[PDB]
Amino acid sequence: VDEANIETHGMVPMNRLTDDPRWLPAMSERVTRMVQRDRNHPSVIIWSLGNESGHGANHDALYRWIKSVDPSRPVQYEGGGADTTATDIICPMYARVDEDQPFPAVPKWSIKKWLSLPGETRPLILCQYAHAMGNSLGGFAKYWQAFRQYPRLQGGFVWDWVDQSLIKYDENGNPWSAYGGDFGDTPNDRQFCMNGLVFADRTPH
Amino acid sequence: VDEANIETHGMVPMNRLTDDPRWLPAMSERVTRMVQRDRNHPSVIIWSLGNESGHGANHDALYRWIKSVDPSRPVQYEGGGADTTATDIICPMYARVDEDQPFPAVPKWSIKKWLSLPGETRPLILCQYAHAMGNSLGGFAKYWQAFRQYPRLQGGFVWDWVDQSLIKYDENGNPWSAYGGDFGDTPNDRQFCMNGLVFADRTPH
Ligand code: NA
Ligand code: NA
Ligand code: NA
Ligand code: NA
């Protein structure tokens, strides 16, 4: 999945820049210039309009731009409820197998319920599931049971591969794995950079 | 649900008479004369082409006959896998909530999985579920949790209301409830006539 370098997660709402036409130029260069560079690679099967930036009208514009200039690949985008007009795939992040999380505007339905909502035609492939932060991947079996039972459940992408720990050296030059704040960075989100199936040195969890 | 007087369950295959054009006349008069008599009752919201008679080309013919003559009401029929071209409603009997029963030709999918199958848009209302024979209705709550969670699961009809017990009198003329074989009837299917939520005298189970 080749993803454009667009994330506006910290805007309030997440929509603020991606729905503004004054940001459509900046956003189009990050989508279009990706397609122009990577369009010949067979490994790329799906284009992504970015991550966690709500759902703005610029998303719908650039979705249709990709469709027009490269019909050979589906386009996906999770923002604004995972099933917007700018996605060919229902690509939720952390939608649970049986339990609904009915957040206002942007609900995370049961992946099994989500398929059968009236008028919903598309496959579902979680762009992110099974958050692997420390001692986790509890209930991972429950996804794959559901994946195998339901044809339109075609799997997902685990979040994620590598702990984003950095090496620091103490006063005597011993290396140790550091996370949020360990460099005087404030504010910070501490451990939440470490979500990997493997440690930073690629040792398996 | 107003249901035509057509069941050919014991034919091998169930399809045998309902696919035969020579039985289209006999079947048409059981469907058409039902509609002519009961088409003014507001209590009647759904027409049924019959019960357990497989899926024949006569079913499709009489389905279209009802659609043409009375658009007011959906038509449903369970025979030949509960999702045939002769039904507006996915009307399985004894489809389970979570577990598939993948019988060749006529599978009973999990009612939740059934809804999500590619191209399937219809509501699902079990024509028969929760077989209440003797000490039964185990797992009844599992259905209703699913009915409430899934919009396109719109419920079902329990099998069934009354024990088909009959009364016999002992040597003193005290009555007792009889079933299959209690009248010298052979062959017979014994207790299988008693499937009700109530006894024959309408005392609840
Ligand atoms: Na599957
Ligand atoms: Na993280
Ligand atoms: Na419902
Ligand atoms: Na029975």
**How would you write chain B as a 3-class SS string?**
CEECCCCCCCCCCCCCCCCCHHHHHHHHHHHHHHHHHHCCCCCCCCEECCCCCCCCHHHHHHHHHHHHHCCCCCEECCCCCCCCCCCCCECCECCCCCCCECCCCCCECCHHHHHHCCCCCCCEEEEEECCCCCCCCCCHHHHHHHHHHCCCEEEEEECCCECCCEEEECCCCCEEEECCCCCCCCCCCHHHHCCCCECCCCCEC
What does the alpha-carbon distance between residue B72 and residue B89 come to, in Å, rounded to a whole number?
15
CB atoms within 10 A of CB B17: 18
Do the Cβ atoms of A110 and B152 come within 8 Å? no
- B203: contact with A, CB 8 A cutoff: no
Question: Which residue in B100, B121, B149 is closest to A113 by CB distance?
Answer: B149
* CB of B134 closer than 8 Å to CB of B146: no
First to last CA, chain B: 24
- B101: contact with A, CB 8 A cutoff: no
Using alpha carbons, list the distances in angstroms from residue B78 to A162, A203, B66, B69, B192: 52, 56, 16, 21, 21
B24's tokens: 């289209």
The separation between CA A83 and the C-alpha centre of its own chain, rounded to angstroms, equals 13
Residue B124, min C-alpha distance to chain A (Å): 11
Alpha helices (runs of H) in chain A, residue ranges in sequence order: 24-38, 57-69, 111-115, 140-149
Q: Kindly state the greatest CA–CA separation across chain B.
A: 64
What does the alpha-carbon distance between residue B138 and residue B131 come to, in Å, rounded to a whole number?
9
Question: Which residue in B117, B118, B152 is closest to A118 by CB distance?
Answer: B152
A96, A99, A102, A105 alpha-carbon torsion, rounded to 10°: 30
Q: Give the closest residue to B105 by CA, choosing from B140, B73, B72, B81.
A: B81
Residue of A109, A113, A117, A154 to mutate when probing chain B, most B C-beta within 10 A: A113
The separation between CA A200 and the C-alpha centre of its own chain, rounded to angstroms, equals 20
- A149: contact with B, CB 8 A cutoff: yes
Q: What is the resolution of this structure in A?
A: 2.8
Using alpha carbons, list the distances in angstroms from residue B143 to B79, B100, B148: 22, 14, 9
- A150: contact with B, CB 8 A cutoff: yes
For residue A55, report the distance from its CA to the centre of ligand 1, in Å. 28
* CB of A136 closer than 8 Å to CB of A130: yes
Do the Cβ atoms of B113 and A152 come within 8 Å? no
CB atoms within 10 A of CB A134: 11
What does the alpha-carbon distance between residue B198 and residue B117 come to, in Å, rounded to a whole number?
37
Using alpha carbons, list the distances in angstroms from residue B111 to A147, B84, B130, B147, B200: 16, 16, 13, 9, 31
CB atoms within 10 A of CB A73: 17
Question: Which residue in A110, A118, A152 is closest to B118 by CB distance?
Answer: A152
Kindly list the residues from chain B whose CB atom is less than 8 angstroms away from the CB atom of residue A151: 116-118
Q: Give the closest residue to A150 by CA, choosing from A187, A176, A111.
A: A111
* CB of A151 closer than 8 Å to CB of A157: no
Q: Give the closest residue to B130 by CA, choosing from B116, B144, B151, B117.
A: B144
- B118: contact with A, CB 8 A cutoff: yes
State phi, psi for B53 to the nearest 5 degrees. -140, 35
- A118: contact with B, CB 8 A cutoff: yes
Do the Cβ atoms of A113 and B152 come within 8 Å? no
State phi, psi for A108 to the nearest 5 degrees. -105, 90
State phi, psi for A81 to the nearest 5 degrees. 105, 5
CB-side exposure of B27: number of CA atoms within 13 Å?
Answer: 27
Q: Kindly state the greatest CA–CA separation across chain A.
A: 64
What does the alpha-carbon distance between residue B88 and residue B90 come to, in Å, rounded to a whole number?
7
A91's tokens: 């690509």
CB atoms within 10 A of CB B134: 10
For residue A92, report the distance from its CA to the centre of ligand 3, in Å. 22
What does the alpha-carbon distance between residue B59 and residue B103 come to, in Å, rounded to a whole number?
22
**Residue A177 forms beta bridges with which residues?**
A167
The separation between CA B77 and the C-alpha centre of its own chain, rounded to angstroms, equals 8
